[PDB]
TrEMBL record, chain A:
Domain of life: Bacteria
GO MF assignments: rRNA binding; structural constituent of ribosome
This protein's UniProt keywords: Ribonucleoprotein, Ribosomal protein, RNA-binding, rRNA-binding
Keyword field contains RNA-binding: yes
Gene3D superfamilies, per the entry: 30s Ribosomal Protein S19, Chain A
Function statement: Protein S19 forms a complex with S13 that binds strongly to the 16S ribosomal RNA.
GO BP annotation list: ribosomal small subunit assembly; translation
Native source species: Enterococcus faecalis (Streptococcus faecalis)
PROSITE patterns the record matches: RIBOSOMAL_S19 (PS00323)
NCBIfam families linked: rpsS_bact
The keyword Signal is assigned to this record: no
Family: Belongs to the universal ribosomal protein uS19 family.
Name of protein: Small ribosomal subunit protein uS19
UniProt GO cellular component terms: cytoplasm; small ribosomal subunit
Automatic annotation (TrEMBL), chain B:
Any Gene Ontology biological process: translation
One Gene Ontology cellular component annotation held by this UniProt entry: ribosome
InterPro entries, A to Z: Ribosomal_uL5, Ribosomal_uL5_bac-type, Ribosomal_uL5_C, Ribosomal_uL5_CS, Ribosomal_uL5_dom_sf, Ribosomal_uL5_N
Keyword field contains tRNA-binding: yes
Function of the protein: This is 1 of the proteins that bind and probably mediate the attachment of the 5S RNA into the large ribosomal subunit, where it forms part of the central protuberance. In the 70S ribosome it contacts protein S13 of the 30S subunit (bridge B1b), connecting the 2 subunits; this bridge is implicated in subunit movement. Contacts the P site tRNA; the 5S rRNA and some of its associated proteins might help stabilize positioning of ribosome-bound tRNAs.
Residue intervals of the Large ribosomal subunit protein uL5 N-terminal domain: 23-79
UniProt cross-references to Pfam families, sorted A to Z: Ribosomal_L5, Ribosomal_L5_C
Alphabetized UniProt keyword annotations: Ribonucleoprotein, Ribosomal protein, RNA-binding, rRNA-binding, tRNA-binding
Name of this chain's protein: Large ribosomal subunit protein uL5
HAMAP family: Ribosomal_uL5_B
All copies of domain Large ribosomal subunit protein uL5 C-terminal, residue ranges: 83-176
TrEMBL record, chain C:
One example of a Gene Ontology biological process annotation: translation
Record bears the keyword Electron transport: no
Subunit structure: Part of the 50S ribosomal subunit.
Protein name, entry field: Large ribosomal subunit protein bL31B
UniProtKB/TrEMBL annotation, chain D:
Purpose: Located at the top of the head of the 30S subunit, it contacts several helices of the 16S rRNA. In the 70S ribosome it contacts the 23S rRNA (bridge B1a) and protein L5 of the 50S subunit (bridge B1b), connecting the 2 subunits; these bridges are implicated in subunit movement. Contacts the tRNAs in the A and P-sites.
Protein name: Small ribosomal subunit protein uS13
A biological-process GO annotation: translation
Keywords, comma-separated and alphabetical: Metal-binding, Ribonucleoprotein, Ribosomal protein, RNA-binding, rRNA-binding, tRNA-binding
NCBIfam families to which the protein is assigned, alphabetical: uS13_bact
Binding sites annotated in the UniProt record for Mg(2+) 1: T18, I20, I23
Compositionally biased intervals (Basic residues): 104-114
Region (Disordered): 88-114
Keyword Ribonucleoprotein: yes
Family named by the database record: Belongs to the universal ribosomal protein uS13 family.
A GO term from the CC aspect: small ribosomal subunit
Organism this protein belongs to: Enterococcus faecalis (Streptococcus faecalis)
Length: 81, 176, 55, 114
RNA sequence: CGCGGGGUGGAGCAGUCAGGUAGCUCGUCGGGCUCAUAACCCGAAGGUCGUAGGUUCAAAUCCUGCCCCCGCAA
RNA sequence: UGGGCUACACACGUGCUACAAUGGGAAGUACAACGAGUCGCUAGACCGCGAGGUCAUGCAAAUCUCUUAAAGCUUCUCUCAGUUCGGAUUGCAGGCUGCAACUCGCCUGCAUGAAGCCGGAAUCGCUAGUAAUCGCGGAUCAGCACGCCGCGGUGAAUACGUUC
RNA sequence: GCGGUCGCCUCCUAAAAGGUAACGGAGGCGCCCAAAGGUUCCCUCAGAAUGGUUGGAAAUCAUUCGAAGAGUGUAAAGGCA
């Protein structure tokens, strides 16, 4: 949110991640929420985001916190002409 | 000459107490420091080579020797006898002054100088440095630095070995 | 040292006013120097997200 | 001259400082106001003390080299993590959600009629 | 294996003798005119001249080879 | 539910901005009309560089607001320059809307500062308050149009004549 | 008869002196240099390894290895550190 208020994130995603407290990477989580932000809690998980046709995985690191999830799951398989 | 006085007074006891020499004439001693600047583009126009000669002069107070090819290489349109860059050989008080200028001015003045390689040896006690980027002290005359080319800076010693050379340069000031 | 070919190589002083260090050596008398061995040290997005939105 | 650029001499101070990679009219006016000089003089009529104060505040401010390093490291970060916004750069495309069909020549470069 | 004549944008050709830095016509592509197509008009693209080297300030051209094509022979 | 209609080697049409000094920028100041408005228009005050935010008044309206319109006029400065033109693109910070602004919103500030120096063949509109230029409002609309519809400001040249 | 050859230089053939033929095998010459001569003085190469900036497989720098594996205007032979 570009308003200086709650950095947006979905309740179920927050809930499942916070339940995953031991931070095991095998605890891979899925979501259709391309619109949520990224937090330090996410840093180190392999989440799978629905890109319109598939759950594409992505491993989070420090360089994603201010970004959205949909930025790492593109929707257009362009390959030149 | 501060560096030479250091070499005589502080280095040599601090060196021999470790390396266990039965005579002071086993001491590692810096015999010379060579500068080189290869250009190649001089084959296009050697005015840049004249410029490199100018900068070596401004740096050292010592006219360089223009090197030349002993071969012709069609891959670079290179002909034997044509001037590939220049070199200088410092020995003595001038050499010590140059090294002290390096350590005390122009190694910090690189943008990200956190140190230098320790493995850059020949396996026989002689060091080889390389400036990738010119303009490392104020009298490089930034107003006319057309291009940054770089330098090879060889530091020759009487050191038998990597270890002798490394410890010597440590006591002399080189921040490994 | 030959004549008429070498630049004038005169004893000059290098001064770090950051630490006041004073060194003598020959070059082409006092000169201005910013940093040196006696003044150089070697001789984030999570934090930023937290600063922007307190957590 | 100031930060590695021989700025003009017939120009006035603000508009001549605009030729620094990091200073526009607003920051130039802010700097000359913080230093306390006239904004309508020409730089070939300055006292070197004014020049030195200008240099001091400019060095306090983030300029040519640091600015290039900062913006380019940002670009390289977003390119290397693999974000959409960096794939745009890596591919040579616009980045702010524009239409890449009938326009975008400022990233495509020259046209290639095919 | 040899003797002649060829290898220049997609096609055909000059320029090779006389080194001076790649062109003629058609064709292709794009845009115009047209109800539309052709013609016409305005633009572009397409080759260091078969190839690896020498000579030269400079080689399609001169020299040396090497690889393909058409005749004979074979 | 998420994605796509927003792709991108390219081609075309209709527009907007321009390529400047009949002009750019800072200041001051003057003259409209149409029309819209209740959980909507919002005065005034304060904060903020700004977009905007807090408080709070009037108005279901020729009573209040949107609304001191901009071009214009008087000064100052710029003095020919890819420029103080041009503003694209890009990085950074923010603001609004709205569950949500990455795909994929609008606006602002800072910084960069591209192409472009009036445009080939050809082709389009227009005869008067017209063209040209200047802004203002409204419909859709939670939020968003260089478009659409309407409004008014300033305000030309030319028409010999039907060979084609 | 055509092709090729006709003059000169080098090797092999050529049989450890020299010489020695063939339409036997391979190559060159019809010049260059005013320093590529003379003398005096000085020096020693090629490549490999290692390291170093653009600089790569490879330019140039430095050390070591390095008996010639280079160069000797131009063919081959002989010879020359
Ligand atoms: K609206
Ligand atoms: Mg858009
Ligand atoms: Mg056509
Ligand atoms: Mg559509
Ligand atoms: Mg402007
Ligand atoms: Mg009419
Ligand atoms: Mg015999």
């Amino acid at each position: 949110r570009s308003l200086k208020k709650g950095p947006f994130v979905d309740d179920h995603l927050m809930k499942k991640v916070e339940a995953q407290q031991g931070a095991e990477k095998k605890k891979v989580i899925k979501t259709w929420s391309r619109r949520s932000t990224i937090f330090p809690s996410f840093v180190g998980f392999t989440i799978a985001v629905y890109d319109g046709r598939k759950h594409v995985p992505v491993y989070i690191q420090e360089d994603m916190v201010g970004h959205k999830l949909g930025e790492f799951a593109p929707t257009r398989t362009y390959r030149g002409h | 000459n501060r560096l030479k006085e250091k070499y005589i007074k502080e280095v040599t006891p601090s060196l021999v107490e470790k390396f266990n020499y039965s005579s002071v004439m086993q001491t590692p001693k810096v015999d010379k420091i060579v500068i080189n600047m290869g250009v190649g583009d001089a084959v296009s126009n050697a005015k840049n080579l004249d410029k490199a000669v100018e900068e070596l002069a401004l740096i050292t107070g010592q006219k360089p020797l223009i090197t030349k090819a002993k071969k012709s290489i069609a891959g670079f349109r290179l002909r034997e006898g044509m001037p590939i860059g220049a070199k200088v050989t410092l020995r003595g008080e001038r050499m010590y002054e140059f090294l002290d200028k390096l350590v005390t001015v122009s190694l910090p003045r690189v943008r990200d100088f956190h140190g230098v390689s320790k493995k850059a040896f020949d396996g026989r006690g002689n060091y080889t440095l390389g400036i990738k980027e010119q303009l490392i002290f104020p009298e490089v005359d930034y107003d006319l630095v057309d291009k940054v080319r770089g330098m090879d800076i060889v530091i020759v010693t009487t050191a038998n070995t990597d270890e002798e050379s490394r410890e010597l340069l440590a006591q002399l000031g080189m921040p490994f | 040292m030959k004549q008429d070919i070498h630049p004038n190589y005169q004893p000059v002083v290098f001064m770090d006013s950051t630490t006041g260090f004073k060194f003598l050596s020959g070059s082409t008398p006092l000169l201005r120097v910013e940093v040196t061995s006696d003044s150089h040290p070697f001789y984030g997005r999570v934090d930023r997200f937290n600063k922007k939105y307190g957590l | 001259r100031i930060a590695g650029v021989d700025i003009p001499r017939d120009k006035r101070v603000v508009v001549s400082l605009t030729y620094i990679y990091g200073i526009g009219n607003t920051t130039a006016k802010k700097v000359l106001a913080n230093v306390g000089v006239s904004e309508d003089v020409r730089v070939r009529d300055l006292t070197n003390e004014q020049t030195d104060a200008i240099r001091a505040e400019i060095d306090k401010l983030k300029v040519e080299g640091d600015l290039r390093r900062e913006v380019n490291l940002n670009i390289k970060r977003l390119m290397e993590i693999g974000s959409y916004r960096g794939i745009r750069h890596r591919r040579g495309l616009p980045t702010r959600g524009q239409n890449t069909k009938n326009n975008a020549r400022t990233r495509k470069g020259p046209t290639k009629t095919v």
